[model samples]
Target: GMSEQERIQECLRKEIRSLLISTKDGLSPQELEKEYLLMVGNHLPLRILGYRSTMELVLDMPDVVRVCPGAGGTVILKAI
Candidate 1:
C-alpha cells in the first residue's frame, strides 16, 4: 500500500488532472489545454498548497491513467 504521503500526492495529482479534463468544452484541444494550465496556476489557489514541487506528480499522472487502462483524465508526460 502507498504511504500516506504518497497517497496524498497521488490524490493531488488526480485532482489536478480531473479539473483539467473536466474543463474542456470543444474540439480545439489547445484551448482546453491553456485553460488547464490556468486552472493549475490559479483556479484552486494551488500556490498556498505549497506542492508545486509535486508538479511531476501531476505531469506523470496521465500516463498512469493511460497505461493503467484507467478511466478519464489528461496525463501530462514531459520530455525528460
Candidate 2:
C-alpha cells in the first residue's frame, strides 16, 4: 500500500485535478486554498502533501495544471 502520508498528498493531488477539470476556464487560487483548508484547516504539511500557499501545491503539479498569472496580479488554475 502507499505510505500513509504519501496518500494524503496523492489524494489531494487527484482532488485538485478534478477541481481544475470541473470548470471550463479554471478556479481562483483562493478557492483551492479554501478546499485545502476545508480539509481540516489543511492539516497536511507544507513540504509535500500541502503547503502554506496553495500556489506552491499546484505548482508542484505543473504537469496537469496550468497556472495563469493574470494582469490583476491574481492567478487561475487550468486543467490540461
Candidate 3:
C-alpha cells in the first residue's frame, strides 16, 4: 500500500510530467501554480495544501523534471 507521501508524489509527478511535456518551453513557479490551481481546482490534496507553491511538489521529481534559471531571479521547471 502507498503511504500518504507516496500518493502525493504520484499525483504530483503525473501532473508535473504532463504539464512540462505539453508546455515544452518550461514554466516558472508562479506560472506552474496558476495552471495547477486551474487544473486541480480549489481543493488541494492533503500534503499539497500547506505549500506556498506547486513548484515545491515538482521539485521533488528530479528524474523527469529539472530546475533552471529564469528571468528576474526565478527558477524554471523543464522536462528532462
Candidate 2 per-residue lDDT, tens place, 1-80, comes to: 47887777677777778767877778788876665567545543566544667777778878778988776888988877
Q: Which segments of model 2 are wrong by more than 4 Å?
A: 35-50
Better of 2 and 3 by TM-score: 3
The candidate that achieves the highest TM-score relative to the unseen native structure: 3
TM-score of 1: 0.34
Output the lDDT of residue 25, model 3.
86
Over 4 Å off, model 3: 1-5, 42-52
Q: Can you write out model 3's per-residue Cα lDDT over 1-80, one digit (the tens) per residue? A: 45976786677678767777789688886787677678767433426445554665555568877898966878888877
Q: After superposition, how far is residue 18 of candidate 1 from its true place, in Å?
A: 0.9
Q: Can you rank all candidates by lDDT, best first?
A: 2, 3, 1
What overall lDDT goes with each candidate model? 0.44, 0.72, 0.70
What TM-score should be assigned to candidate 2?
Answer: 0.68
> For candidate 1, lDDT tens digit of each residue in 1-80?
35875776666556555754563332123343455557566443245445353342333455533222113653233221
Positional deviation of residue 37's Cα in model 1 after best superposition, in angstroms: 14
